[PDB]
Design a protein around this nucleic acid. Structure first.
Ligand code: MG
Ligand code: MG
Ligand code: MG
Ligand code: MG
Ligand code: MG
Ligand code: MG
Ligand code: MG
Ligand code: MG
Ligand code: MG
Ligand code: MG
Ligand code: MG
Ligand code: MG
Ligand code: MG
Ligand code: MG
Ligand code: MG
Ligand code: MG
Ligand code: MG
Ligand code: MG
Ligand code: MG
Ligand code: MG
Ligand code: MG
Ligand code: ZN
Ligand code: ZN
Lengths: 58, 83, 55, 118, 100
RNA sequence: AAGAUAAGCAAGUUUAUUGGAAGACCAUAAUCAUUCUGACGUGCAAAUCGAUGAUUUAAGAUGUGUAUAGUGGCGAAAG
RNA sequence: GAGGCAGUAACAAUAUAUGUAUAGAUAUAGACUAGGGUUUUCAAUUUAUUGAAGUGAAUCGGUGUUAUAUAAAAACAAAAAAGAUUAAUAAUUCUUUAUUAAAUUAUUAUAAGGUAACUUGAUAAUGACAGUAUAUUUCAAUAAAUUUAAGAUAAAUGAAUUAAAUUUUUAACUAUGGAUUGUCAUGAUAAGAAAUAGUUAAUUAUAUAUACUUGAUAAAAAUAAAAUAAUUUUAACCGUACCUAUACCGCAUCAGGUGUCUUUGUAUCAUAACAAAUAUUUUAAAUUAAAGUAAGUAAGGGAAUUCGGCAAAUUAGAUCUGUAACUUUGGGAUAAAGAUUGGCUCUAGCAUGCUAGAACUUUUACUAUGUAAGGAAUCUGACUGUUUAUU
């Protein structure tokens, strides 16, 4: 038989981040723009705000 | 808005001298500007090639200068033909 | 010596017709033939040799 | 010594000379009318050329200052003088600007080929 | 460990586009595809002429004439709005001659 | 950097966004060769190895085809 | 032709009491072209010697067109894919379903319809052409659910880990209409907006639509017709084994050099590193020399050593405050100088996976890997760039 690497270690660690544990100030190594883009957050906001104005007119 | 007196020539940074960047600000202002179409009357004429000016709406090409839509030596010879 | 743009396309092809003929006067070049699936003249002649052996 | 740079540059022009267009206009007996078709750009020169159409034949010419696509011009020995028209030399009054002069009659053109120079 | 199967030359030119398809038995294969073609355009107004079949000119001769043309004079070359300017222009230039 | 939008104060002028120009800044793969005057020095090798360094959308790197020959060719120039 | 130095320098040296196995150890791997030419496979005798066998094409390359009087196996060009067989060939052999071209057969429309954009047998079209940035998330891949199977644990565990499959409206144009309206950004309209009714298409990431840089505006030529069904001792010539570095070039089984592409899992910017997959490999001694080539640590002093701080050491990621003289008004600047960083349990926002705050606890938190020493002056060159292949 062949071997395949197990992901039981990584499935646990991804669950604690889903509660927001391991994203401290001491475990960041990139900038604020690298972890979250500032351009995409403006496109998310201006597309939703343009949708809700059409509904209030109709 | 961020610049006090340099304007469009702030892309060059802190090189090439002082008076060489003054000569770039005169020419680059008139190249990037859009003009009125003499045919259709709309403001959509832009430059794409040296000596060729074309409109976006009516799509009619005009001959002209290198960096300006009209040439100062080009307009004086139109007046003497009107008389 | 002034020509139209439309007449100049004729003089190019007439120039490129002479260059096709002067190739066959150069020594030591392989001969240019037609493509095989379009040249119907060669397919008739080789088939004539083919059934001649059958007799 | 060796052969210097100046002589070695001229013999490099005989192995591969430079190529340009040399645009000339035809000759016609009486005044005809032609239309401007399009404006193009060549590799070597800076001034744009123009393609005019006389008697369903397309030639090439140097573009004058105010010229747009579809305009009509006249060619002949006695055409009226205006922007872009081509007339004889005796008709124009003193003080104007011309930009293609043939040395002799029935020639294409010799003087004033580049852009900006009149 | 699975291996993609490639057949042919490996240069990425214009005519060598490939895609990856999965077989029923479990192989992986890089199959070649046809060359990309574009829409025909008007000779004057330069708009996209739809309803004409866009393909390579070898296959384009095999189509029917209704798939190559439009039921209109100058149907293969022009857009159908440019002909409205032509017919009015060609008629009016005749009536100018008879006066002068 | 141009370009564009708003909110204030009153011909204009401050504040906040959007936008993404430049022979601008920094790294991996790839490239070069400053220092240790390190290793080796009948060597792995008729010019290599290790650490340390310089480099990034261009006046770049590279396969194939045609052209240039010894009082001659090619050269951002050291014979 | 044969000595001394001399069996000296210099190189090679994994474990098992019974084994076609159980273990250890080092190295990423696989395909096209240039070069090599039988090294391929098998049998017999000991990386050798001899002897047999092996390369199957209408749709895979060449043979065709040209680069402004001899030029392309990566530019242009009629057409196919699965599934199995051999000791060795397989888009070429065999089975199943297709496609192109040419010769002979059977049959026949010469025009209708829509106000319009257009629909149906009803010709005259093209090959054919820069670079960069942003927005689409097509495919594909992840993630979830389900159904069959596998391997292990002294024990224990709301049921862990691995494999296969099945699923998870927009742009043009036309007719009415008569003055408003969009994008992440720049806007569009009396040369007719929104709103209605309709006709075409949606180019599959090497794509589509916009924008931006230029005294650079981004190749040639051969090449065309069409309805439905059928037939064929119809589709010529050449190459198709094997190697990608111990099967190339450097006199060699040489730590050098050599065009293109593909490649699984963890990895909160990446990088670095580790594991998969696949390929190779058999037996001297040792708690003890000196002097070497590498890697570590050091009480007290801190450049007194030296031509010279040559070599080594200190600093470093990310968040928050703060930032001078000078100036070609753009810069100097990431100047300099300070403070914070773990684990667990919650609270609060909306964009739903990112960011602030609070409580508890400890031999205190970027630091395994990666990661700027700083300041003040003088001479010379404006800057990006290039150069004596080997001092
Ligand atoms: Mg740069
Ligand atoms: Mg040394
Ligand atoms: Mg010779
Ligand atoms: Mg000297
Ligand atoms: Mg040894
Ligand atoms: Mg043998
Ligand atoms: Mg094989
Ligand atoms: Mg097969
Ligand atoms: Mg073969
Ligand atoms: Mg083979
Ligand atoms: Mg190779
Ligand atoms: Mg080697
Ligand atoms: Mg010892
Ligand atoms: Mg000490
Ligand atoms: Mg101490
Ligand atoms: Mg001292
Ligand atoms: Mg001393
Ligand atoms: Mg040092
Ligand atoms: Mg805390
Ligand atoms: Mg310098
Ligand atoms: Mg040197
Ligand atoms: Zn206009
Ligand atoms: Zn049109």
């Amino acid at each position: 038989l062949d071997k395949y690497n197990s992901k039981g270690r990584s499935r646990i660690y991804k669950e604690a981040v889903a509660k927001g544990r391991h994203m401290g100030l001491g475990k960041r190594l990139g900038t604020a723009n690298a972890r979250l883009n500032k351009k995409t957050l403006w496109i998310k906001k201006i597309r939703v705000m343009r949708k809700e104005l059409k509904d209030m007119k109709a | 808005n961020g610049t006090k007196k340099v304007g469009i020539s702030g892309r060059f940074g802190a090189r090439y001298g002082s008076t060489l960047r003054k000569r770039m600000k005169k020419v680059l202002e008139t190249q990037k500007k859009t003009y009125e179409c003499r045919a259709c009357g709309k403001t959509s004429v832009k430059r794409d090639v040296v000596g060729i000016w074309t409109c976006r709406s009516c799509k009619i090409k005009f001959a002209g200068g290198a960096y300006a839509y009209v040439t100062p030596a080009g307009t004086t010879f139109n007046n003497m033909l009107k008389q | 010596a002034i020509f139209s743009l439309e007449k100049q396309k004729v003089m190019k092809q007439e120039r490129l017709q002479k260059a096709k003929i002067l190739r066959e006067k150069i020594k030591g070049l392989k001969e240019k033939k037609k493509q095989y699936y379009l040249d119907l003249a060669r397919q008739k002649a080789d088939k004539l040799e083919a059934d001649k052996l059958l007799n | 010594g060796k052969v210097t740079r100046k002589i070695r540059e001229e013999t490099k022009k005989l192995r591969n000379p430079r190529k340009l267009s040399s645009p000339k206009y035809p000759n016609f007996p009486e005044t005809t009318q032609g239309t401007v078709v399009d404006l193009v750009h060549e590799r070597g020169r800076g001034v744009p050329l123009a393609h005019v159409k006389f008697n369903d034949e397309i030639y090439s010419l140097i573009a004058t200052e105010g010229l747009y696509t579809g305009q009509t011009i006249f060619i002949g020995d006695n055409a009226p003088i205006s922007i872009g028209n081509i007339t004889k030399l005796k008709n124009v009054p003193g003080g104007m600007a011309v930009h293609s002069i043939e040395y002799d009659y029935e020639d294409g053109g010799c003087v004033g080929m580049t852009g900006g120079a009149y | 460990h699975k291996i993609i199967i490639h057949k042919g030359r490996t240069y990425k030119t214009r005519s060598n586009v490939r895609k990856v398809v999965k077989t029923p038995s479990g192989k992986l294969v890089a199959r070649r595809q046809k060359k990309h073609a574009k829409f025909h355009r008007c000779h004057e107004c330069n708009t996209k002429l739809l309803s004409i079949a866009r393909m390579r000119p070898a296959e384009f001769s095999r189509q029917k004439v209704s798939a190559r043309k439009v039921n209109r004079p100058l149907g293969s070359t022009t857009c159908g709005k440019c002909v409205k300017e032509k017919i009015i222009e060609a008629f009016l230039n005749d009536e100018e001659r008879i006066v002068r």
